[PDB]
């Protein structure tokens, strides 16, 4: 009836479409918005410098989440304000739902006189609620690291809203910290997850000061093409340098060596 062998399949890798899409991320850095109305006034006010935030958007991907650790201090006379001074990129991989950081926290001389303020991460879709997995990730970090106090550390989400980027920031609750430790359900709606597990914090973008980045000494930060070489127990040290974009050549050496291989 039908003559088969009619048409031949042609491989169309999906990472190419995202690589082309990642090259236009710089346009979103001119229109970055912060969730405003809040409930307000109270906690610490976290001030994020624009230069590292724009760089954090440029090195990311539209669907695979990336994360960086927050470090900073307070102004000399104003303890209720937290200026974010450094973002640390560590070996990581992620999905559309979460990221996978190692167990070890950043440890370096430059950061020892700064206090950790939490972590910032991207996500594809703007959401009204903090991710239940973000609550689990933040709580499991607090359980293993007493330097992360629940009243001092936050979770900044950089949502990809069409032609823009929206920043909302949350902190954990004692109820949220307690449930996040026990949670072994990665599903998008586990049992026990409630809106009572977090609150919003006030966040301000500033041009008055500049932050800086810290990246792995050897290595790099993006392991989304080398997930085998990523392990939760992996160790790493840092250097004072700016990070490479997501699809930089050093993050996907197999694409360059397997193409050259005959």
């Amino acid at each position: 009836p039908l003559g088969s062998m009619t048409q031949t399949f042609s491989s169309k890798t999906e990472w190419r479409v995202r690589a082309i899409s990642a090259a236009n991320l710089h346009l979103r850095t001119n229109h970055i918005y912060v969730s405003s109305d809040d409930i307000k006034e109270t906690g610490y006010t976290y001030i994020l410098p624009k230069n590292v935030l724009k760089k954090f958007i440029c090195i990311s991907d539209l669907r695979a989440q990336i994360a960086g650790y927050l470090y900073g201090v307070s102004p000399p006379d104003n303890p209720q304000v937290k200026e974010i001074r450094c973002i640390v990129m560590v070996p990581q991989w992620g999905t559309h739902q979460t990221v996978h950081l190692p167990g070890q926290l950043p440890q370096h001389e430059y950061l020892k006189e700064m206090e950790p303020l939490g972590w910032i991460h991207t996500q594809p879709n703007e959401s009204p609620q903090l991710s239940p997995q973000d609550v689990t990730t933040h709580a499991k970090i607090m359980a293993d690291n007493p330097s992360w106090d629940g009243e001092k550390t936050i979770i900044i989400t950089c949502s990809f809203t069409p032609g823009s980027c929206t920043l909302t920031a949350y902190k954990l609750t004692p109820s949220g910290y307690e449930w996040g430790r026990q949670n072994t359900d990665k599903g998008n709606n586990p049992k026990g997850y409630l809106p009572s597990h977090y609150e919003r914090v006030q966040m301000l973008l500033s041009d008055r000061f500049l932050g800086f980045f810290m990246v792995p000494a050897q290595s790099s930060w993006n392991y989304n093409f080398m997930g085998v070489r990523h392990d939760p127990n992996m160790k790493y040290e840092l250097q004072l340098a700016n990070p490479k974009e997501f699809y930089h050549e050093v993050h996907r050496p197999s694409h360059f060596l397997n193409f050259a291989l005959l």
Partner: protein, 1722 residues
Amino acid sequence: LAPRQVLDLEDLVFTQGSHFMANKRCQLPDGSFRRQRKGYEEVHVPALKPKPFGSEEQLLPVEKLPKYAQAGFEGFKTLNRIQSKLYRAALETDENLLLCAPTGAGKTNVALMCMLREIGKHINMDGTINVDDFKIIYIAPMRSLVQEMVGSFGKRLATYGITVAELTGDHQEEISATQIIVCTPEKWDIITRKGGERTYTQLVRLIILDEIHLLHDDRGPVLEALVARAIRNIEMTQEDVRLIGLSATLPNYEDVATFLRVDPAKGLFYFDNSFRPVPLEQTYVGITEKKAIKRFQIMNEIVYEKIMEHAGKNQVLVFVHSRKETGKTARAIRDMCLEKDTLGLFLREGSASTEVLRTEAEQCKNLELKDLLPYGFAIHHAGMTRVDRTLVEDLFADKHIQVLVSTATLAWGVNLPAHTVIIKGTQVYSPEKGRWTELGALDILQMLGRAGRPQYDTKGEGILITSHGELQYYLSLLNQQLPIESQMVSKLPDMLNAEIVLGNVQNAKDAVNWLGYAYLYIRMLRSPTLYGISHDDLKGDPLLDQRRLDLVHTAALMLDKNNLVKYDKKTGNFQVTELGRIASHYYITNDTVQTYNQLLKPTLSEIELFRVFSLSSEFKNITVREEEKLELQKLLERVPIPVKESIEEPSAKINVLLQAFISQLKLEGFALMADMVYVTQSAGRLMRAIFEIVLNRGWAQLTDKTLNLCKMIDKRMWQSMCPLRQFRKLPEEVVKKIEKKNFPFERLYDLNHNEIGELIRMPKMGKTIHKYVHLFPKLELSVHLQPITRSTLKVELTITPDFQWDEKVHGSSEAFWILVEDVDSEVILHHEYFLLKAKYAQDEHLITFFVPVFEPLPPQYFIRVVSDRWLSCETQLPVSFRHLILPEKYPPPTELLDLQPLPVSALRNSAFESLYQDKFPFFNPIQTQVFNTVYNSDDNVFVGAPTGSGKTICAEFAILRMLLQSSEGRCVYITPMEALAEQVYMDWYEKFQDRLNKKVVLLTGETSTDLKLLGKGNIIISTPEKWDILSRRWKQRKNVQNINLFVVDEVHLIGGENGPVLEVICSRMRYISSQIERPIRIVALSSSLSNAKDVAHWLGCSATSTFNFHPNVRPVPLELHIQGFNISHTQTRLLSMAKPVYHAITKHSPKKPVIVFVPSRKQTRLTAIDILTTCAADIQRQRFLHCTEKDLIPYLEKLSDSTLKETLLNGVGYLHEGLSPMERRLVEQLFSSGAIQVVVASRSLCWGMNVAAHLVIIMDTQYYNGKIHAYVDYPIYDVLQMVGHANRPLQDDEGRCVIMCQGSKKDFFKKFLYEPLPVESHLDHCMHDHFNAEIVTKTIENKQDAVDYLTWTFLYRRMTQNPNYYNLQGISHRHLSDHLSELVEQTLSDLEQSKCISIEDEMDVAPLNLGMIAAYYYINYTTIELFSMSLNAKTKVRGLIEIISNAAEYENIPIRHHEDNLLRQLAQKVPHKLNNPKFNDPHVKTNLLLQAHLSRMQLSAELQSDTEEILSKAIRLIQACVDVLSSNGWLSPALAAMELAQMVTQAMWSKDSYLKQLPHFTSEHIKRCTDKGVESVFDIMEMEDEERNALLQLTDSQIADVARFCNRYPNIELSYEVVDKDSIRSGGPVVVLVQLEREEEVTGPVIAPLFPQKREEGWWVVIGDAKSNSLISIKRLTLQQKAKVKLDFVAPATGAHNYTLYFMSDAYMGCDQEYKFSVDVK
């Protein structure tokens, strides 16, 4: 020139290029016959008869040639007919030549004869030649041909010492030490396109254009560009260059001759095809079959039938058009033969050449060749190895190979003729055209020129096969009937831009002039209808003026639309751009750079970068063929860099082809492989152009991406590949899995040699990989941050190489890029090129640059040093600002009080008021404020005010107060520049000595001549070091502490180069004032200082006495404009300022005088002419001549410069170092008179120029340093001085000055010209020579004293206000001591190692003899240390001259190698030879300049002023060794040095006369008087007056000059006695008394006209016997009428010794007396 049309250039283009056929018909020689066979038509042309001469034609034997040229014809008995008719025009005239002959006639030797005539013009007496004077360019069309010429010409001229080389310099020494450059037209085009202050084109005396009929090819316009550029540059410079054209015999050769400026009656030589070496029987086969595959085998049928007609009888050379068809056809017509059993004709005889053809096809190792070589056949192409190709031609030359299939490469680069030549098809794939096209005309003529061995064959047989429709073309080409036309209308925009970038074409009329030199223009005049010009139009325009301007107008618009040029349609002017320069310098078409300018953005992807490259117009003809889309789509699915565009687009194909080439993928499509070669061989310069664009724009991320892509294209590998494979000799099988073990490459540095073996699981590759890991280039970085202000940061970057050098992988150099990036790695704050030379591969390198900072101190900056060549070779240094201590903000200035102008009457002194009352009525506001503190006080005062604020008068206020207080008070005035001291001297000598009858002096630099003037003068003017010499002896000199007033001018120069000396002397005057009880008044003057309070406290001036004014209170207001300029290439940027210089004159001062400062002397005259032609094009000529026509010739025609006369006649002068002092004075007078409005002064003259202007223009702020061969920024102190000249108080309401700078230097000048200047100390880097002087004078006796001495310095005050600048990390008191003690510890440790000082018990220091000599004569401790090593007991004049030369004092004044040979040939002009001298040292440079001055050799203009600087330090160094030799007890060497003192003074030798020092003395008077034998100077003072015109009588005054010299010739009476000759013991008190007497009084100083400084008589009294070579006692004295000397020695035990008394001078020769003792020991 206004009503014109815009043309369509592409409609004027000959599309077929070289295949264009201008002749409508073709006439064939007698005996031709066309034959119609089935499928194809044959055309036969019989061989031509070399019709037997006629008139005189003797073959010229090389014995008759000029003798110097016979060595180039060694191995040749007699020239052929072509060379013999050309040899006199070639060897005996400089006429431009054009020689057309069939290929093989011997045109190469005719060019060799012109090359020999050029070589003969520079043959020196030595036998060798002068490599400097000349350079020869041989332009060959093919790269393969260029290489053969390098060997041939190199061997023929090897006996001359001539070097011939091809491209070795594009990749950068390139061209120098290379007298004959062989190159392609394109290569010479790009080399001469980036014309800097070069060392190439000006040395070019001869250009040979071989195969100049290339003009008809698409590459032809390159030859038109070369000739036009050379010929037009001839008339601009009026320096001749000889052009030689060698062409085939084709029509329009007379137009070619007009194009080369060849006189047709002298240099035109045309020889038809009858002059072929062997006659040629031509056969042309034209196929009518149009279907592809039947025509394919028809072609394969005609080749076989033709091969069979020569099998066995003749070798046959078959040409095809690929590296693949060479073996494919050679097999296609081998097997066809076996099919018919038709090889008994080739081989098949058991011949003596059958086994050799076999037996060499086993040591063959070529698979395809060994398949074919045994059975007669063979192939040859570039893909085969060198010995493989040399194999096939060694057999073919010995007549062993019968069938050889090759391509065009063999025809060009090898001399391999065959009896029969077959051209199988004339179609070749062109990737540039993107299609198949016909063969070029040059390839056809070269291949068929190989037919017929010029010795064997009575005839050659050339067979050409092609399509029937191209028969008429190839008959036209090979039978002298294909005319040569110009293909230049296509390339016109790109070539016009190349002349705009060079500066040769600055407007439309320059372009019309330039176009008139093009071969297109000559062809347009002769055959206008071929070039779209009606004869109706040609006479409405006889010389095609309107037509050329239309072409230029059309071309200029295209350049303007693409942003290469700014075209001003009204004036027709052209403005150069950076984009236009990059297009010219990188050989990029103008459409491509427009695409780059449109799409390049700093946020660019690697995806878009590859896409932008694929859109370059060089690939405009590339298309995606349907038969290629499958292989292309298979790659698009796997490429590492994604491609957005569809495979339908040709840009996607170009993109994939580039990615495949980097990954080293081999493709299948024949077009794809050739298309890949074309895109990638263009990717080099294309991507290198993109790199220079984004680098000079500061785009950090894109610069890193483009520079990497450049290296990935060159190395053919991605970053992910392990960088070890960049070593080609390293096995490609170990790297295999070193990549696959996923671990960083930086880990192998920290491992041994057998750990790498187990980590990779290959212990056999132990040390081999460890070897290359540490051969990979690697640099370690360190910084010392030095804050200047709170907004400007100075950085000293130390680069330490951390890799072992190897020439076989690194070469002679290794280049890097230094990049300074901001916080976000987004903006390049600063960048520069860094070159690690092999000779310094193990030394640390220091780099300094400025960087802006702002005050919420950024987290950090980054300093990357990436390689220019190596992939994955980079070191980034984070520059943290966490612990950076910024200096404090400078305090507000002292307000300028609104006081009423103070009249000159306030001095209240008639004689004092008499010095100013004429010049001006009232003092300026700045002189008014300080008046009471200076004139009515003794407090130390600091006056800081801008240049031109009248600070010279306030210093005079303190001088006049000193004259009131004491009658014989002494003032010492210090100014940092000698040029300033000479002008201050001229002013103050007239005001204080002429009018008020005091004594004003100017220090010489001669110690003893100076010392008198301090006791003689009331105002001593001196430079810092000329007062350091004097004040060092202040505890022994009373004329140093008696000083009432010490005034130091321009004290802000303590931060400059020679600042540390200015810091020591004033610090000494403050310490001297401490020891005596009467303070010495100190007045400090400076330009506006930000840290003025530091200088005041350091100089002990109270707050109310410190006047810190800022630039805003300058008396005459200063309007400062700072124009930025984008171009990073200096010569192009200087061009971009030419018209802005003129436009700034008309805008800011069209009426009042203007000074223009330019970087170099050559630029002075260039811009002076540039201003004039712009004024003439403004039809405002002679606007700058406010004087007249004739009142000026009483000033003109007094100069040697011809251009200086023309410039002044139009109102513009210029000043530079090369003009004689009389010319500079006269140009200044015309400028100050208002006669001339503009003067162009060099940067070197900004300190010694006594003229001012209303407007000053600083054209650029850099200058080239000849030593380090790099551009250096103007010191900020020189810029302040230049701006100071824009100030005329009683002439102009304001002052204006425009500073044209590079864009990067703009904000720097804004921060340090509008704000006051911060100054620092650098005494910590110049501590040794001063510490040694204090050890000698016992001011420092221990290490605690050294710390105490430093507390008196400006350095001590600054290292607590700005600690990081001096590498302090805290202003603690202990951080100060540890810093001061460490400086003290090393400085004294260096001195004692040099044996200058002695240290006892880690604490006490005491001077040694070496240190006492270095301090006494002001010599570097490093110099006097090397003197003791070199000098010994047997040194005379030739060793003294040797080691005095290589001293640290002479080192840093440049070495120019436009004189590498004069000094090589002056070494061949000296009495004393050198041992293995190499003429690369600024020290051996002086050694021969010293020998030249003693030889009285006039060398060059300002080489002489260079030896004036060598002579100013020679006497002090000679006396130093005199001290060294005598201290060691050596007699013979000391007296030889004591006579070179008088040798270097009178410029004579010991071999020479004594009467050589009398004035006006003729040359040969040394033998003159030998007939009488009277050579004494003695004589010539005592003869009788009517003949005491002894021998010679010269004028009424030239004897009165001999009279004054004889009257001040030293006539000294010597009385000597040994006190108590009868009471001497064996080692007791001994005393000898010598008494001197001047039979005279004294008539001023020594008479030495050949010596700059005026010296005074020095004398040595010497004792010691010459038998033992022992000096026992020596003393120095100055005579002056009568004096006695005493020598105390020690008796040498017992005996009867007899010593010898020497009395020697240091100035005159011929007075060294000699008496011998009368002793008696007991």
